[PDB]
From a paper:
Extensive optimization led to BI-2865, a derivative with a prolinol substituent and a pyrimidine linker, which enabled a direct ionic interaction with E62, as well as a water-mediated hydrogen bond network with the side chain of R68 and the main chain carbonyl of Q61. We established high-resolution cocrystal structures (1.0–1.1 Å) of the pan-KRASi (BI-2865) in complex with several [name] variants. These showed a conserved binding pocket across variants defined by the α2 and α3 helices, the distal portion of the β1 sheet and the distal portion of the Switch II motif in [name]. A part of the KRASi pocket overlapped with that occupied by covalent G12C inhibitors, such as sotorasib and adagrasib, with the notable difference that the pan-KRASi engaged the pocket without relying on a covalent tether and did not extend in the P-loop channel near the G12 residue. By comparison, the affinity was 60–140 times lower for [name] variants loaded with the GTP analogue GCP. Selectivity for the inactive state is probably conferred by the conformation of the Switch II motif (including residues Q61 and E62), which partly occupies the drug pocket in the active state conformation of [name]. Drug-bound, GDP-loaded [name] variants had diminished activation by nucleotide exchange, either when the latter was stimulated by the nucleotide exchange factor SOS1 or by EDTA, as well as under intrinsic conditions.
Author numbering: 0 to 167
């Protein structure tokens, strides 16, 4: 049967989680997507010659640590932790997202990719070296993306699938 991979996109508001997701789903850059909409979106894709079904949860809204929200996030098999390369605060938030993923998955070994989005913009405030070194600290891949140009989009999502495959 066709394997389904449940991927969850997390990170600060405004980093481009929705734009990245929609580039994967629609193959279109959407510069405006209601910042409060949290939803999941499926798409069949070929990854290393194997058709699989991606189910991508694009997170949004208020930080909440209820049992219900933990259970919803626990359905994720792998996580994209997204910051924007022109927003230092979004990068400084990453460790919090990673810690919460480790907690809900009750595992030090959750499939994960660090994503530095908005790589098309000149206003960089987070050095590539610093982001690469954070991914190294965590032992995870780092992918530079742009939802605007499609740079890195498949790399980010497909790497996460490959990481889930390895973990399984
Ligand atoms: C960085 C923070 O801000 C926000 C703002 C919005 N969201 C978060 C946030 N942290 O983890 C999560 C996820 C969605 C990630 C996947 C696993 C779980 S499990 C569960 N229950 C979750 C939730 N809510 C999550 N989201 N954090 C700073 C720092 C602390 C104060 N705060 C202002
Ligand atoms: N230049 C540029 N703008 C982006 C990119 N991704 C998202 N944006 C913009 O960043 C803002 C927030 O994007 P959105 O997808 O809503 O972020 P979310 O809150 O993480 O879902 C919007 O103004 C988008 O147009 C990108 O890669 N490049
Ligand atoms: Mg959004």
């Amino acid at each position: 049967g066709m394997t389904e991979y449940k991927l969850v996109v997390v990170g600060a508001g405004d980093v481009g989680k929705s734009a990245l997701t929609i580039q994967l789903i629609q193959n279109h850059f959407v510069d405006e997507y209601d910042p409060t909409i949290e939803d999941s979106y499926r798409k069949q894709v070929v990854i290393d010659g194997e058709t699989c079904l991606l189910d991508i949860l694009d997170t949004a809204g208020q930080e909440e640590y209820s049992a219900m929200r933990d259970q919803y996030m626990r359905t994720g098999e792998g996580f994209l932790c997204v910051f924007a390369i022109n927003n230092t605060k979004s990068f400084e938030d990453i460790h919090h997202y990673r810690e919460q993923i480790k907690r809900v998955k009750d595992s030090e070994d959750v499939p994960m990719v660090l994503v530095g989005n908005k790589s098309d913009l000149p206003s960089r405030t987070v050095d590539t070296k610093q982001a690469q070194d954070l991914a190294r600290s965590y032992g995870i891949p780092f992918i530079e993306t742009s939802a605007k140009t499609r740079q890195g989009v498949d790399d980010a999502f497909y790497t996460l699938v490959r990481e889930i495959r390895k973990h399984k």
